[PDB]
Amino acid sequence: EPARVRCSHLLVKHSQSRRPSSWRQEQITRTQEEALELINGYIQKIKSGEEDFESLASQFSDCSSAKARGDLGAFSRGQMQKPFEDASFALRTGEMSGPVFTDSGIHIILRTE
């Protein structure tokens, strides 16, 4: 295990998220069900090739790392919420997670380093 991984991510928030607003929407109104549908819709478009992970994240991620095309930079263990940390460290570089759940909402993660 490396000390640190670098990942990008795409966050979809929902109305029950820890903090239900984002840079792109003043109040998050979508239900958790709609959030997971969006996430799965993204996974299937990135898989077929119709959409690009980092373009989607710059447009639609509810995390302000959208401005950096999803890039969170490098992080060690003990910094990120545990489910996000665990999914990140289990990816190979270039590999994308399935849906990942944290208090902030639902994520997909791309390990870059």
Ligand SMILES: O=C(O)CCc1nc2ccccc2[nH]1
């Ligand atoms: O806008 C916020 O409240 C923070 C968004 C957020 N929450 C995260 C949790 C884990 C990793 C990245 C994350 N980005």
